Structure formats: C-alpha cells, structure tokens
Design an enzyme around this catalytic site. Structure first.
Site, mmCIF file in Angstrom:
data_model
loop_
_atom_site.group_PDB
_atom_site.id
_atom_site.type_symbol
_atom_site.label_atom_id
_atom_site.label_comp_id
_atom_site.label_asym_id
_atom_site.label_seq_id
_atom_site.Cartn_x
_atom_site.Cartn_y
_atom_site.Cartn_z
ATOM 1 N N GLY B 10 71.948 41.931 41.970
ATOM 2 C CA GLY B 10 72.631 43.120 42.448
ATOM 3 C C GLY B 10 73.966 42.790 43.091
ATOM 4 N N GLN B 11 74.675 43.846 43.482
ATOM 5 C CA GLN B 11 76.030 43.667 43.997
ATOM 6 C C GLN B 11 76.054 42.807 45.260
ATOM 7 O OE1 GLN B 11 78.940 46.829 43.809
ATOM 8 N NE2 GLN B 11 79.375 46.615 45.991
ATOM 9 N N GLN B 15 77.860 39.151 45.398
ATOM 10 C CA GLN B 15 79.090 38.973 46.165
ATOM 11 C C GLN B 15 78.862 38.034 47.340
ATOM 12 O OE1 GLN B 15 81.698 43.009 45.167
ATOM 13 N NE2 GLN B 15 80.354 43.125 46.983
ATOM 14 N N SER B 140 70.102 42.858 48.155
ATOM 15 C CA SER B 140 70.001 43.951 49.119
ATOM 16 C C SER B 140 68.603 44.564 49.115
ATOM 17 C CB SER B 140 71.023 45.038 48.808
ATOM 18 O OG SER B 140 70.864 45.545 47.499
ATOM 19 N N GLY B 143 69.897 48.538 47.258
ATOM 20 C CA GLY B 143 70.395 48.861 45.941
ATOM 21 C C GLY B 143 69.265 49.114 44.955
ATOM 22 N N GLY B 146 69.094 45.445 43.447
ATOM 23 C CA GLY B 146 68.654 44.534 44.487
ATOM 24 C C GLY B 146 67.244 44.818 44.965
ATOM 25 N N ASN B 206 73.275 44.811 57.919
ATOM 26 C CA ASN B 206 74.718 45.036 57.795
ATOM 27 C C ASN B 206 75.307 45.609 59.081
ATOM 28 O OD1 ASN B 206 75.546 44.003 55.339
ATOM 29 N ND2 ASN B 206 75.288 45.940 54.201
ATOM 30 N N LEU B 252 61.628 23.423 51.050
ATOM 31 C CA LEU B 252 61.335 24.842 51.278
ATOM 32 C C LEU B 252 59.998 25.043 51.968
ATOM 33 C CD1 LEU B 252 62.535 26.435 47.954
ATOM 34 C CD2 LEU B 252 63.716 26.256 50.154
ATOM 35 N N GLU B 254 58.789 23.333 54.377
ATOM 36 C CA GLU B 254 58.881 23.175 55.829
ATOM 37 C C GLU B 254 59.315 24.461 56.501
ATOM 38 O OE1 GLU B 254 59.991 18.418 56.017
ATOM 39 O OE2 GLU B 254 60.511 19.733 57.700
HETATM 40 N N1 GTP Z 1 76.726 42.576 53.311
HETATM 41 C C1 GTP Z 1 76.974 43.106 52.107
HETATM 42 N N2 GTP Z 1 76.306 44.230 51.718
HETATM 43 C C2 GTP Z 1 76.534 44.787 50.514
HETATM 44 C C3 GTP Z 1 77.456 44.244 49.627
HETATM 45 N N3 GTP Z 1 77.447 45.037 48.517
HETATM 46 C C4 GTP Z 1 76.553 46.034 48.702
HETATM 47 N N4 GTP Z 1 76.004 45.902 49.952
HETATM 48 C C5 GTP Z 1 74.956 46.732 50.555
HETATM 49 O O1 GTP Z 1 73.894 46.742 49.596
HETATM 50 C C6 GTP Z 1 73.284 48.027 49.517
HETATM 51 C C7 GTP Z 1 73.552 48.670 48.176
HETATM 52 O O2 GTP Z 1 72.966 47.907 47.164
HETATM 53 P P1 GTP Z 1 73.837 47.090 46.088
HETATM 54 O O3 GTP Z 1 73.457 45.589 46.080
HETATM 55 O O4 GTP Z 1 75.320 47.368 46.191
HETATM 56 O O5 GTP Z 1 73.376 47.859 44.764
HETATM 57 P P2 GTP Z 1 72.790 47.106 43.502
HETATM 58 O O6 GTP Z 1 71.769 46.074 43.849
HETATM 59 O O7 GTP Z 1 73.924 46.544 42.737
HETATM 60 O O8 GTP Z 1 71.961 48.213 42.702
HETATM 61 P P3 GTP Z 1 72.599 49.406 41.824
HETATM 62 O O9 GTP Z 1 74.116 49.448 41.916
HETATM 63 O O10 GTP Z 1 71.938 50.665 42.315
HETATM 64 O O11 GTP Z 1 72.164 49.058 40.423
HETATM 65 C C8 GTP Z 1 73.975 48.888 50.541
HETATM 66 O O12 GTP Z 1 73.198 48.846 51.719
HETATM 67 C C9 GTP Z 1 75.315 48.190 50.726
HETATM 68 O O13 GTP Z 1 75.827 48.458 51.993
HETATM 69 C C10 GTP Z 1 78.134 43.083 49.996
HETATM 70 O O14 GTP Z 1 78.957 42.511 49.249
HETATM 71 N N5 GTP Z 1 77.876 42.543 51.240
HETATM 72 MG MG MG Z 2 75.402 47.623 41.479
#
Ligand code: GTP
Ligand code: MG
Ligand code: NV4
Ligand code: ACP
Ligand code: GDP
Ligand code: CA
Ligand code: MG
Ligand code: MG
Ligand code: MG
Ligand code: NA
EC number: 3.6.5.-
Lengths: 312, 439, 34, 423
Positions: B10-11, B15, B140, B143, B146, B206, B252, B254
C-alpha cells in the site's frame, strides 16, 4: 467560542459551574457524546480518559485527575499512606482488610476503641460485621456549649499546572448531640444529624469566622495558628506525594479537580486527616463563590475570556 | 548470518519503505547505484548488513525487499526515483486499480487476483536466502490495500513459511493525516485477521508523528516526506540490531522473546529521542540521562497514551551514538525514583540495553539535525490499549447504524465478519485490562 | 541494581539491568473463504 | 484511471461544453487541442479526462435527440476540440417528454451512443467510470439520459456512474411537465448512480438575483455558477497532490447508505468577475458554508451533514485552512452527525481556477437535500392528482401506474433522509 459537555447530571458543583459558563456568552454546551469539546465535566465512574486529547485543533480539559482515586477511596488511601516513602507520617490515624494486615491489626490491639468503614472496643465484634479498621479518636475537641463533636471540611482545587488552591471558606459539620464515650453524637455526617439538630448553628454547619471567634474566646488562639497550618501541611503532603503519578504537565489533555478534605481535631489541637473526597458537594451558602473561583482559576486559565483561594 | 525479507504494502508501506532503504543505504555507506566501497568481499559475504542486502557479481547491494501496491503511481516513484538502480523490476509489483479505501476489496476482490504473483516474487527472494528468518511487513491500518491485502498476505505467509517470524510496522490512522472515513472499519478488520499471524507489531500513530513534526521540527504543516523520514529513523533504530554487530535483538525471534511474553499482547510502545530541528543553528547536545528521561514523556511516544496508568511487561533501550553502560545505569537509577514505572508482578523489573556507537544518520537536506546520541525505547505496556479503545469506539459509532457496511458486503464480505472482528478486539481490550489493572 | 549478560564488540555493547525480581488456517480453508 | 464523460440534451450539452472550456483552460489546452501551458501539474493527470501529434482530445460523448444545441457546441469557442465521431444525435427531438427520451425517440438512438461509449472504453488503460451531465426537467437529458445510465450499468456493472443533474424550478422553467420528468428521473438515479451532484436551478437563480445582483439572469449566468462548481468538485480527480481522489473512493467515503448519494455542492467566492480583492481563508470558509452559496436550494441548518469534502485552490496557508475548517465543525457541531467520526475532510490544490487567486469548493452529503425532493414531489402531486398533462406520456405507451411508483419511490427517498436526520 468555547465548547463543553456535561456527563454528570448529579453533580451539584458543576451544575453551577456550567450555568456560569453559559452566562458569559462565550461557552456553548454540546450534547454528552459530542467529541468536539474543549471542556468535559466528566462522569464519576469509568470516565474515558483514553479518548481525551485526540481531537485535532482542540485543547481539551477535564475536571478529574486520572489516578486521583488512590487518594480518594479509603482502602487506597491507607495503602498509599503506608507504602509511599514520603508518607508512611503522624496526622493519619493508625488504620488497617478483606471479608493482608489482619495479623498485624490484632498485634497492635494488644484506650483500645476502633472504627470500621468502607464502632467498637472489641475486635471480635467488627471483624465479623465485615474494609479498613481505623483507630477511633477517643479524645476529640468538643465544642461548647453542647459538649459536641465535629469535623472540618476543606475544599481544595488543583489546576492543570498542578497548583494547589485551598478555598478560604471551610465548614465545620457538627454533632448536635453531646458526646458520650459510653452512634449519632459520634457521627458528624450532616445527613445523619438531620435524620436522627439546628440547635446552636443553622444546619449543624459552623463557618470559619465563627469558629475562629470561638477559639479566640475559649482557647486564646486562632483558627490559623492552631489548626490551618496543619491543614495546609496535610493537603500539600497528600497531593505532592501523588503528583508524579497523576500530573497532566506534559500530557495530550489537561486535568483539574476539586477535592474535599475531611479533618478531625483532638483535645490538644492536633489535626487528623480522616478522608479525601474526589466528588465533593459544597455548603449552599458557598456554592456561588466557590464555583466562580473554579471558573476563574481552573477553566479560564486555559480558555481565557474577552482571591478566594490560599495558594498552597 | 540469517536473512530478513522486507515487504511494503500500500501507499504508506511503500513510501515509508522508500525512506527506510534510503536511510539504510546511508547508514551502511551504500551508494544509490548499489555499490558499497566499504565491502571488500565482492559479490558475496555473510556480514551483518547482508541480512538486508544481497550482492551481485558486479558488486551491487540489492535490498531483500518487495514493494506491492494495487495501483502503480506510488511504486512508479521508486522505479524512477533516486534509487531506481538499487531495486530490480521483479521486486516492484503494481496492480491496475486500487482497493478504494475498502478492506473487503483489497482482501477478497483484488487480493485473490494478485496474491499468487506477490507470493511468487517473494519466493524468488527466499530462494536466495541460505537461512531466512522471516519477514518485516510495512503497511497502514487504514488503507484498502494496506489493511485488506496485508491480512491476506500474512495468512498466506504463515502457510508457505510456517516456521518463519513476522514483524509488523503498522501506521495507525489519524484524521490529521488524510484518512478515509472508513479507516476504523479497515483497522479492526485487519487486526482481527492478522492478530494470530504476526509475532510482534510496532504501531505508529500518524497523530504522534505529525505532532512531533510540528512541535520539535517546527514544521507548520508536515508533509508525507517529513512524516516518513521521522518514521524511518525510528524503524532504523528498531532494525539496527539485525544489520549491525551486537548481541541484543540479533534475530527476529529475540524480538518476541524480549518484548512479548503473551502472544496476543504483541504491540510494543516505541518512544524516541531526541528529535531536533536542523534549521536550529546551535542546540545543546542532550545527555544520556536527558534522552533516557525523555523516553518516559508521552510527547515522545509513537502512540499517545499514558504508561503510568498501565503495567510494563518488558522494556528494551536502544541507544545510538556516544553512550556507555555507566551513564545508562546512572540515568535509570535516577529515573526509577522519580517516574511511575510499574511492572506486572510475574515479570522482572528491568531493562535490556543495546548500544551502537555510531550516532544516528540523517538524510542530507532533511529537517532532522545530527545528534551525538539518541535512544529508542521499546516497552510492552498495557497503556497502548488506549489506542485500541479509541479505535474500537469509533467503529462502534458507525457500525451501530451499519454506515458504509454495504461497500464491504458488495465485495463479497459477510456482515458477520464485522462482529467477529469487533469481538476479537473486545477480548483484546480485556486481555490488556486483566494484565495491567487491579480492581 | 544488577547488571547481567554484558557483551562487547567493536560496534558497541549490550547488557541487562535488573532492578527488582518478580513476585492456524490452511491453504484450502483460505481458498474457500476467498 | 480514465473517466468517460457523456453530455445529453440541451442543458447537458450546454453545461457540458462549459465544463470542457473551463478545465481545458486550467490544463493549458487551447481550442485546437494543443497544450501550451506553463506548469506540469497540468499534464500529470491530464489523461483522466483527455485522450492523446501530441494533441489532447476530451474523452467526451455528445448526445441529443435534435441537432440544434450540438450545432451550437460545434460552432462555439472550443467546438473544434471534440472528436467528430463522438457527436451522436437524432432529428426528432424529445418534446420535453421523459417518455419520448426513455421509451420511443431515445430508444431509437441509444445503441449508437453505446457504440461510441464502447470505443472510448476500449482505448482505456483502466476505466474509472462515467460522468453524465443533463437536466432532469426536459426529455432527452432526463429520459434518454437515464436510459443510457441503465444500459451503461448493464454493460459495465463494476464501474462508477456519476451525474451532474440539473433539477428544475418554477423560477426558471421551460414547461409545466418538469416535475413529471424530474420525478421519473430521480427514481432512475436512486437505483443506477453511485454519486449525483444535485444542481438546483432554484438555488442558481436565487444566487444570481440576490448575491450577484443580476436582476435578469440568463442560462448563461446560471451556467457560470455550474461551470465553477464542476471545476472545483473535480479538482482532486484531475490534479496530482497530497490526496489523489477518484470516483470510487468518492463514493465509498461519501455514501453511507446506497440510496443517499445525492450531494449538495457549494462554492466560494460566488461571482457573476469584476473584483480583485482576494478573500482571506476565513472568508472563503465562511461563504462556502453559507446557505447563500450552495447550488441546491436547501437549508443545511434544517438537516445534518453526513459527510463533507472540501477543496481549497490557490496559494494560501494550509495551516489557516485546517484551522478554519476545524473551526466550522467545532462551532456548529450540531449540524454534523455523531455516528460518522471525522466526517469532514479537506484538500488543497495550488492551482487556482481562472480569474481567481483563491477559491473553495464543498461537496456535501446532507439530509437537508430532502427539501429538494419534497418540493418536486409537491409539484408532481399537484398535477398528478388531476392527471393533468398525462396524455403526453400515455400517448407514448406509459401507464399511470409508472407515475404512481415513481411518486412512491421519491417519497420513500425523502423518508429515508429524514430517518437519519433524527438518528
Ligand atoms: N505516515 C504515513 N502515512 C501514510 C502515508 N500514506 C498514506 N498514509 C496513511 O495511510 C492511510 C491510508 O492508507 P494508504 O496506505 O494510503 O492506502 P492504500 O494502502 O494504498 O490502500 P488503497 O489506496 O485504498 O488501495 C491513512 O491513514 C493515511 O494517513 C505515508 O506516506 N506516510
Ligand atoms: Mg493506494
Ligand atoms: C472527488 O474529490 C474529492 C474526493 C474526496 C473523497 C473523500 C470524501 C469524503 C471523505 C473522505 C474522502 C477520502 S480522503 C482520504 N485521504 N486518505 C484516504 N482517504 C477519499 C480520498 O480520495 C477520494 O476520492 C475520497 O470523508 C467525507 O467525504 C475528498 C476530497 O477532498 C478531501 C476531494 O475533493 C473535495
Ligand atoms: N477515626 C475516626 N475518629 C473519630 N471520628 C471518626 C473517625 N472516622 C470517622 N469519624 C466520624 O465519621 C464521620 C464520617 O466518616 P467517614 O468520613 O469515614 O465516611 P463518609 O461518610 O464521610 C464517606 P465520603 O464522605 O467519602 O462519601 C466523620 O464526620 C467523623 O465524625
Ligand atoms: N442550469 C441550466 N439549466 C438548463 C439549461 N438549459 C435547460 N435547462 C433546464 O433544463 C430543463 C429543460 O431540459 P432541457 O435540457 O432543455 O431538455 P432536453 O434537451 O430534452 O434534455 C429545464 O428545467 C430548464 O430550466 C442550461 O443551459 N443551464
Ligand atoms: Ca560482501
Ligand atoms: Mg464526608
Ligand atoms: Mg544465511
Ligand atoms: Mg430545452
Ligand atoms: Na422516429
């Protein structure tokens, strides 16, 4: 425009506090379960401290200290006063169990009157009524005329900075029944005095101005010297002891809390802590003044708008 | 030497995974083209850094990492980023259309389509491992990918790698950092489904990262880059022991031994210090006592909660920089007499301490200043259950009206799975209360 | 306050400090659900 | 993630052509389709609405049962830019008659439209879904448009259907049968769309007359408001940033119950332009949420917001936006539901629209929208109790039963919205 919620309808004190917040035009009351509040006048039990301080863009304040119950319930207070290096003392009656320290209670039992709560001279009689067993103060200071017993209630405010404020006005809750050491002339509880009064003072409630005059006329001393110095000592000892445990200094939400301390005074003008109350009510004559002081120092200090306390 | 495979889903996981590997390369002196001048065994080795990097005959050090997102835009910024050359195509896996913030779509509808591929690409990494320890999974809670795909993958990893450990780094949702309104649902659904497949999970809220970025870096509105570079610092503090010489948390297993007495209570609280703005010219260097004391300040925790109103089961102190044991024990002795630090009765009141003399690395041009010493505390305290109670409460509000539920049922999920999940979290909250409170 | 299990290497050191002693679904079942 | 845009009938094609003029400008596309802009946010997600000699072509299908209005689009400023094979029209017209659009005249033309839809969908790397512009008060947009929506759903059941639906008002009326056409159409939308922006001609007229102090508002004035709204409401779909939205995430996050997917947009600053004083972020937030700024004639204080999505455009203080957005909720918490936590979300885009240094746009799922369906229901009922004007529809094969069922379904919809105003 500040927002607040009310989750204790049975609160005498904060019923008055909210009505004063409204009457400034700068405070709005929300519904109980609306999370978007600045100020919570919380419930007495199971107040949800873990959900406070997580709303974006909201400074949040609550009128209880999480963890204060350790001072404010009688078993916790005996334990607290017994295991805290900073108190464990002299102004707390020798106190002691579940239906442990049973072997130890009987060891000191070897005047030998005690009281149980959570009154007898014979240990056997009360261990089977069962809780804490506290040494009953056989030699109290007796008001006259009346040869009568009393307790002192003090109101104490602790703000979000953990400043400790003792309200100028105490109240003596008196027995209207002469003291016979051979259970009504023994319990100064007002609800027990107006059910089992009004004799000498309106409501079995003597306030400080009169009680000070009494000590000047009857004992050639003052309320300040003979009693209040000890009171302030005790209030500080208890609250500074628990401060690291409950302080909201660096927390994501802020607390304040109003406490009611109950003291006994003995024949030698020594003051004894009886108990601490975490949800006290007030004397009707004093509600206006004390609830306004709560707003001034506890609420507007955090949420400013557009002294009745001694600083301990 | 035993290898670790990192998986980013996931995002947020991708990232954040970008930021960590950037940091890992800096810490180990690995250039963006994968070359490592310090490494004198070309094309092989079993040094400690080989737990996270394999080597090509050309001398390139390749992350044992897989990136997975059901949409291509985030992973494409890895393909074309500063470390393009580090990864190879097979490790970057993108689907066509994402999970639309919907656990059920990420888990059932799209997950079915893509799980076998992801597992196949992970198998290609496991086959290069002489002794795989297991996995580190970044994702996450909130998401659709995620939450929904991660839980499917963790189930399948327990199948295909039954003896292997699995650690999570989980981003817990906070409205300050753009969240879907259904993130409470996704969070509960994925915790329920992942609980028995994860051996140890580090939650990062977050809200906590965001506030540290505002308060200590004086960034008015922090970006994902700001957030992720701080998170990567904490992650790197947690994983350093796997990648460097040492004797604490060196594999891992431990982590579980040292942090998790009870398998379900496997969410340690992380607390990190110090976090210092880099545009702050002259700043006094914090001492061992001060940074250790800061580990008991809720303002430095990865999840905001109050450990004084809970009990400790385990505590590890992970120092980086100029730190000697003498100073640690002095600081601990002082702190024991001033802080409220209660362990459960069935556990030793003590601290496992690890020190790596190399001070933390920061990203050139980032917002974090170099410090001469830092510490990450990992404590298993029942106080973290406040985070579950908060999330569970939001779930209840919405579920009482079945708000949004139809999006989940329309993807083939039964309404009963909401109740299943929520009841598991209810047990979880009571497990914590049993362990850490007395009546 | 006891210090135990002290280990040192060129990269750093580790130890423990004690202050007080104490008082799976199958591949098929997954495939069915999906 | 491509969107296929369809514009149907007179209103549909007029507000449709304005939408393409406005966003084509924002993305730097000139009337001849060549890109001549100065920033690269412009092209990053251009493919959401445009296909690609390095010219850009709107993924737009233009539909009408008479050739007039589409001759006007082809002669208009950006007329050259549409793909000529994507003009799909008949000769008969629909006579402001839902039945003709839905059952007789429109049925004849709908397969031609779906061939063009299909061709556009095939050249799609990953089709997000559809966006339809139309009115509900006429015959082609209303009757044929909802027939298209039904045929599209049947062929693309897993894609999102989004509409900008112009609701009729006696204050800006072409015929007396508008409540009939609108009631028949709402029924179609309740079932076959995932998101409908309610663009209420009563609200647009009021805004033109009171606020913009235009005493004789034209459809051109109304369409200036709709154009600004359509741009703002699609910003996060077309521009890269923090939050990259799409049609499915829109629906998952704004629609808690499948039938309540009718949104009230809001916009600030409202303009007829003529002013150079840019607004402070406090003022944008104040006006945007003011009733006098919403494109559906509903009083939000008469209902509650289920979900809200706001977007601020231009260069301005992110920190001040969050502060003002949080201020509005924390000051009127009574108008947001308790049982959807954190139901107001805010985005920012650095690229302002044209002629404005900063703007704000608001998407709201509010229970106050029931007032719009009540209004229509009342007007419908006033005629239908006497069966007035019904012969226009029974002459096309329809039975009264179908009107009764549409009346019933719309009253149900009003009831459902009231159910959650009291939750
Ligand atoms: N700390 C941090 N939180 C993130 C980031 N990107 C998204 N989030 C958080 O992750 C959650 C959203 O899920 P994402 O990971 O963006 O979504 P995804 O897993 O890509 O799933 P979909 O887009 O629905 O397919 C929210 O709570 C966001 O605030 C990041 O780069 N850093
Ligand atoms: Mg996404
Ligand atoms: C179509 O334009 C927008 C859509 C959304 C919208 C959207 C709409 C919502 C909402 C949430 C969310 C979420 S926000 C999110 N951030 N991370 C994950 N999810 C998501 C994201 O993608 C989306 O499409 C969702 O709550 C109530 O209304 C939001 C917008 O601004 C806030 C946009 O402009 C107003
Ligand atoms: N050791 C003691 N010695 C003498 N009198 C005592 C005593 N303990 C209690 N009393 C008397 O009992 C009365 C009230 O007792 P106590 O304070 O212990 O219970 P309570 O009714 O006040 C519970 P709370 O006020 O917290 O709700 C006091 O006013 C005092 O007269
Ligand atoms: N806002 C707006 N409304 C319009 C426009 N043209 C027509 N309408 C409204 O649309 C309804 C009539 O529908 P129309 O589109 O002309 O009929 P159609 O061609 O059969 O679809 C009435 O409610 C008109 O007020 C326009 O350009 N802008
Ligand atoms: Ca090597
Ligand atoms: Mg009392
Ligand atoms: Mg090996
Ligand atoms: Mg017309
Ligand atoms: Na014909």
């Amino acid at each position: 425009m500040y927002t607040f919620v009310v989750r204790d309808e049975n609160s005498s004190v904060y019923a008055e506090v909210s009505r004063l917040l409204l009457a400034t035009g700068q405070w709005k009351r929300l519904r109980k379960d609306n999370p978007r509040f600045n100020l919570m006048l919380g419930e007495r039990n199971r107040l949800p401290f873990g959900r406070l301080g997580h709303e974006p863009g909201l400074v949040q304040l609550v009128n209880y200290y999480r963890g204060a119950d350790k001072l404010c319930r009688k078993a916790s207070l005996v334990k607290l006063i017994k295991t805290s290096p900073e108190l464990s003392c002299t102004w707390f009656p020798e106190s002691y169990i579940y239906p442990d320290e049973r072997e130890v209670f009987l060891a000191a039992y070897n005047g030998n009157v005690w009281i149980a709560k959570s009154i007898s001279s014979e240990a056997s009689e009360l261990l089977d009524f069962i809780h804490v067993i506290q040494k009953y103060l056989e030699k109290p200071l007796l008001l006259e005329p009346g040869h009568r017993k009393f307790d002192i209630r003090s109101w104490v405010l602790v703000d979000h900075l953990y400043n400790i404020y003792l309200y100028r006005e105490g109240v003596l809750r008196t027995s209207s029944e002469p003291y016979n050491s051979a259970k009504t002339c023994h319990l100064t509880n007002h609800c027990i005095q107006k059910e089992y009064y009004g004799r000498y003072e309106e409501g079995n409630e003597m306030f400080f101005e009169e009680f000070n005059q009494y000590l000047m006329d009857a004992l050639n001393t003052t309320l300040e010297n003979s009693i209040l110095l000890q009171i302030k000592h005790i209030i500080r000892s208890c609250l500074m002891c628990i401060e690291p445990a409950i302080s909201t200094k660096h927390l994501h939400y802020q607390s304040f809390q109003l406490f009611g301390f109950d003291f006994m005074v003995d024949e030698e003008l020594k003051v004894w802590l009886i108990e601490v109350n975490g949800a006290p009510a007030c004397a009707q004559k004093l509600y206006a003044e004390l609830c306004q002081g709560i707003v001034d120092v506890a609420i507007s200090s955090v949420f400013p708008l557009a002294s009745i306390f001694i600083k301990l | 030497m035993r290898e670790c495979i990192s998986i980013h889903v996931g995002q947020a996981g991708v990232q954040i995974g970008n930021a960590c590997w950037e940091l890992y390369c800096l810490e180990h002196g690995i250039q963006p083209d994968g070359q490592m001048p310090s490494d004198k065994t070309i094309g092989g080795g079993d040094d400690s850094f080989n737990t996270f990097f394999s080597e090509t005959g050309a001398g390139k050090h390749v992350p044992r990492a897989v990136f997975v997102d059901l949409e291509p835009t985030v992973i494409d910024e890895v393909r074309t980023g500063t470390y393009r050359q580090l990864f190879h195509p097979e490790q970057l896996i993108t689907g066509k259309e994402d999970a639309a913030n919907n656990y059920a779509r990420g888990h059932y509808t799209i997950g079915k389509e893509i799980i076998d591929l992801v597992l196949d690409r992970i198998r290609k990494l496991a086959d290069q491992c002489t002794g795989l320890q297991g996995f580190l999974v970044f994702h996450s809670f909130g998401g659709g990918t995620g939450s929904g795909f991660t839980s499917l993958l963790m189930e399948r990893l327990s199948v295909d790698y039954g003896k292997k450990s699995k650690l999570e780094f989980s981003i817990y949702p906070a409205p300050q950092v753009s969240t879907a309104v259904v993130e409470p649902y996704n969070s509960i659904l994925t915790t329920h489904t992942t609980l028995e497949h994860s051996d140890c999970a580090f939650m990062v809220d977050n809200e906590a990262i965001y506030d540290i970025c505002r308060r200590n870096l004086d960034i008015e509105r922090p970006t994902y880059t700001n957030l992720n570079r701080l998170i990567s610092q904490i992650v790197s503090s947690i994983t350093a022991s796997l990648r460097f010489d040492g004797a604490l948390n060196v594999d891992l297993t431990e982590f579980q031994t040292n942090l998790v007495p009870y398998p379900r209570i496997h969410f340690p609280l992380a607390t990190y210090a110090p976090v210092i703005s880099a545009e702050k010219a002259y700043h006094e260097q914090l001492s061992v006592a001060e940074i250790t004391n800061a580990c008991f300040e809720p303002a430095n925790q990865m999840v905001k909660c109050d450990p004084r109103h809970g009990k400790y089961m385990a505590c590890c102190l992970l120092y980086r920089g100029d730190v000697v044991p003498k100073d640690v024990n002095a600081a601990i002795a002082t702190i024991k007499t001033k802080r409220s630090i209660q362990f459960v009765d069935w556990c030793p009141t003590g601290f496992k301490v690890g020190i790596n003399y190399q001070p933390p690395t920061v990203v050139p041009g980032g917002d974090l200043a170099k410090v001469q010493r830092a510490v990450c505390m990992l404590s298993n305290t029942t106080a973290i259950a406040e985070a579950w109670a908060r999330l569970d409460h939001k779930f209840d509000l919405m579920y009482a009206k079945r708000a949004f539920v139809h999006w989940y049922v329309g993807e083939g999920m039964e309404e009963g799975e909401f109740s299943e999940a929520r009841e598991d979290m209810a047990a979880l909250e009571k497990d914590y209360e049993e362990v850490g409170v007395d009546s | 306050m006891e210090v135990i299990e002290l280990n040192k290497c060129t990269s750093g050191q580790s130890f423990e400090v004690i202050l007080k002693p104490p008082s799976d679904p199958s591949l098929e079942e997954i495939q069915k659900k999906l | 993630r491509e969107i296929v845009h369809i514009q149907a009938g007179q209103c549909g094609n007029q507000i449709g052509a304005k939408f393409w003029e406005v966003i084509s400008d924002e993305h730097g596309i000139d009337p001849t389709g060549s890109y001549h802009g100065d920033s690269d946010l412009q092209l990053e997600r251009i493919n959401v609405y445009y296909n690609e000699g390095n010219k850009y072509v709107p993924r737009a299908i233009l539909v009408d049962l008479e050739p007039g209005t589409m001759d006007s689009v082809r002669s208009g400023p950006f007329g050259q830019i549409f793909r000529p094979d994507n003009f799909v029209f008949g000769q008969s017209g629909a006579g402001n008659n839902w039945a003709k659009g839905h059952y007789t005249e429109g049925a004849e033309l709908v397969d031609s439209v779906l061939d063009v839809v299909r061709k556009e969908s095939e050249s799609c790397d990953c089709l997000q879904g559809f966006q339809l512009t139309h009115s509900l008060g006429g015959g082609t947009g209303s009757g044929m448009g909802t027939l298209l929506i039904s045929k599209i759903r049947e062929e693309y059941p897993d894609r999102i259907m989004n509409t900008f639906s112009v609701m009729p008002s006696p204050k800006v009326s072409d015929t007396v049968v508008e409540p009939y056409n609108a009631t028949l159409s709402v029924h179609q939308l309740v079932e076959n769309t995932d998101e409908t922006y309610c663009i209420d001609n009563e609200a647009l007229y009021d805004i033109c007359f009171r606020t913009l102090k235009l005493t004789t508002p034209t459809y051109g004035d109304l369409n200036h408001l709709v154009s600004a709204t359509m741009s703002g409401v699609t910003t996060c779909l077309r521009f890269p940033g923090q939050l990259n939205a799409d049609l499915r995430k829109l629906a998952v996050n704004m629609v808690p119950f499948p039938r309540l997917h009718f949104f009230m947009p809001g916009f600030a600053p409202l303009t007829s332009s003529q002013q150079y004083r840019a607004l402070t972020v406090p003022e944008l937030t104040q006006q945007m949420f003011d009733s006098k700024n919403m494109m559906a004639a509903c009083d939000p204080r008469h209902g509650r917001y289920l979900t809200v999505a706001a977007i601020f455009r231009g260069r301005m203080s992110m920190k001040e936006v969050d502060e003002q957005m949080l201020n509005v909720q924390n000051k009127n918490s009574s108008y947001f539901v308790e049982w959807i936590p954190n139901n107001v979300k805010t985005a920012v885009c650095d690229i302002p629209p044209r002629g404005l240094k900063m703007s704000a746009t608001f998407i709201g799922n509010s229970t106050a929208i029931q007032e719009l369906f009540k209004r229509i229901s009342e007007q419908f009922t006033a005629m239908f109790r006497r069966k007035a004007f019904l012969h226009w529809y029974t002459g096309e094969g329809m039975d009264e039963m179908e009107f009764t069922e549409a009346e019933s379904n719309m009253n149900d919809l009003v009831s459902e919205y009231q159910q959650y105003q009291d939750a």
